[PDB]
Amino acid sequence: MNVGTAHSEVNPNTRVMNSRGIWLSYVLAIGLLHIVLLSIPFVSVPVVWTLTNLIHNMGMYIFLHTVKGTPFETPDQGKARLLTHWEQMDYGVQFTASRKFLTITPIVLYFLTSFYTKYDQIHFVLNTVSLMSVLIPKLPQLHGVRIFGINKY
């Protein structure tokens, strides 16, 4: 369908994270990923937890801070052809329940995966690097800024 047939909003994308049941689906997706990773027979539990953390963080980074634009043609004439999804969310309003939830969840996952890996240092460096790679773009300061001009266009 065409954008605007049943709703006046020029950019539906901005609201996809405020819909009914998106949070529970996201949490259940994380849970299903963890179950699938635990399913592997020859892999130890700390490795399973660190794999869960790394995979979830990489996917979240790709979907929220890398892919820019919209998957559908929008009738505001390409205003967001350069913005990523995190910048598009809620039309740039910086603090909102959705953004708070999306920032909080990786930290809780980090606590859990740190405890279940018995605080091993080799796992610690990877988990902290991944958590920082996710949490750094979430800052309001890094809104519409690209370091060394990567992913500008």
């Binding site: 179950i35 699938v36 635990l38 399913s39 592997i40 027979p41």
Partner: protein, 62 residues
């Protein structure tokens, strides 16, 4: 009667998992991944997890 019910349940699985609109080979890919995951999960459950759920399943069957 049973075969019709199984066909209807497969139809509902297709509608829910959005495989209805996908091409046949995409359905094959998704089904193969799903069956592989389920089988490997059951093998891991048998090897490591205690077979207490096995006794419950046997009692339910009996």
């Amino acid at each position: 009667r049973a075969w019709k019910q199984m066909s209807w349940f497969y139809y509902q699985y297709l509608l829910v998992t959005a495989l209805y609109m996908l091409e046949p080979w995409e359905r094959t890919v998704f089904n193969s991944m799903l069956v592989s995951i389920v089988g490997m999960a059951l093998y891991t459950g048998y090897v490591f997890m205690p077979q207490h759920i096995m006794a419950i399943l046997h009692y339910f069957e009996i």
